[PDB]
Amino acid sequence: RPTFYRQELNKTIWEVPERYQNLSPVGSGAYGSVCAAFDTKTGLRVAVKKLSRPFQSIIHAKRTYRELRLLKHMKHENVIGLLDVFTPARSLEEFNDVYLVTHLMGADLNNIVKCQKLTDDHVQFLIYQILRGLKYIHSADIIHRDLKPSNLAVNEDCELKILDFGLAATRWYRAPEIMLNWMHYNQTVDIWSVGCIMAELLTGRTLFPGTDHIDQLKLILRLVGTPGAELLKKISSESARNYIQSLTQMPKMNFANVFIGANPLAVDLLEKMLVLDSDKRITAAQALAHAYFAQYHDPDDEPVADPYDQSFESRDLLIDEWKSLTYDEVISFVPPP
Ligand SMILES: O=S(=O)(Nc1cccc(Oc2ccc(F)cc2)c1)N1CCC(NCc2ccccc2O)CC1
Numbered sequence: 001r002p003t004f005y006r007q008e009l010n011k012t013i014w015e016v017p018e019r020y021q022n023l024s025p026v027g028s029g030a031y032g033s034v035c036a037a038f039d040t041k042t043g044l045r046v047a048v049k050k051l052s053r054p055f056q057s058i059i060h061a062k063r064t065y066r067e068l069r070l071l072k073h074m075k076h077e078n079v080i081g082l083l084d085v086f087t088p089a090r091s092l093e094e095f096n097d098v099y100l101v102t103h104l105m106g107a108d109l110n111n112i113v114k115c116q117k118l119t120d121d122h123v124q125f126l127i128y129q130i131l132r133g134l135k136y137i138h139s140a141d142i143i144h145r146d147l148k149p150s151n152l153a154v155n156e157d158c159e160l161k162i163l164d165f166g167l168a169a170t171r172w173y174r175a176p177e178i179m180l181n182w183m184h185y186n187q188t189v190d191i192w193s194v195g196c197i198m199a200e201l202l203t204g205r206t207l208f209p210g211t212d213h214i215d216q217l218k219l220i221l222r223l224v225g226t227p228g229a230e231l232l233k234k235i236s237s238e239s240a241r242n243y244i245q246s247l248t249q250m251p252k253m254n255f256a257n258v259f260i261g262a263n264p265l266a267v268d269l270l271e272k273m274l275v276l277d278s279d280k281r282i283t284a285a286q287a288l289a290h291a292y293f294a295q296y297h298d299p300d301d302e303p304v305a306d307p308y309d310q311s312f313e314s315r316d317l318l319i320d321e322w323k324s325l326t327y328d329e330v331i332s333f334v335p336p337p
């Protein structure tokens, strides 16, 4: 058992193995607190996340276990995986804090764009990697559902890793079916997000700048058009159908016009991602074969994930059960090569 050392950072107490040195806050929110640290074992900077109050409630307890399970399963170059997980506690009885460790890339997509004007080749590489990671997570039946530039870690070689998936402004990249609260959705909500991100990288501006969700929904419908007979056919709720038609009264926008000077292939791909009907949206695996990624696509190097056991998701357990399951996972953790 490594020796730990305590430290107070921005009001929050951090107790970590001496292995991690020079803690530096990067990170704060409802998801927990995040610090950058120097992993002296490998010589590389890492990201350390201290979960808020992991076992405060059943919902907290379950999401603590969830994130631990998720990270322990992901092993892909475009997806954050678990480098280490630890707790200062020596027993289940004293177990109250959980720390997760992963790669620190250095910047997020917003930062990259802030400093550099992306070339079309940059766009293919960045989106290609997002889609490649997405094919992987989606294959394990996991959905990000909050894909956005701040959830995209990029290193100085513009290589990318998807961050904080399977856990959930955010709205700009959110799929319309979510903003409309239509129930039971699919993996392509992430594809819609990728479309909003890609458009942004091409035009340099937010595609659907809605002050609120309604304003934004009107902007979405204005661009991808009123729902056809086919889509309206799958919406049961009469109130839902009427309301959506009521939001598509803005003058129609032409898709090609919005993305003028961009690569023709880029625009075609954008059209296949920003489809109102999620059943007709291109999937990540399909997207990877699109001609826009000709220079990067390789079917022998775009793997899917090992079977992921998430039967715990349809389980309603007590705090102490969720806590014990989490503790067992912390103990059984074996670091990667
Ligand atoms: O600016 S960051 O503090 N940088 C960062 C960079 C790398 C890893 C990381 O979090 C970790 C750290 C260690 C782990 F093992 C897992 C995640 C955070 N961070 C803050 C949180 C943000 N995601 C919020 C978020 C959380 C849950 C659900 C939807 C969401 O959008 C993503 C970016």
Ligand SMILES: CCCCCCCCO[C@H]1O[C@@H](CO)C(O)C(O)C1O
Binding pocket: 176, 177, 180, 182, 183, 184, 185, 186, 227, 231, 234, 244, 276, 277, 278, 279
């Ligand atoms: C109606 C236009 C604004 C909202 C667009 C939502 C488009 C959803 O599209 C799809 O959603 C899935 C559930 O998420 C389905 O199960 C569908 O049948 C479907 O068509």
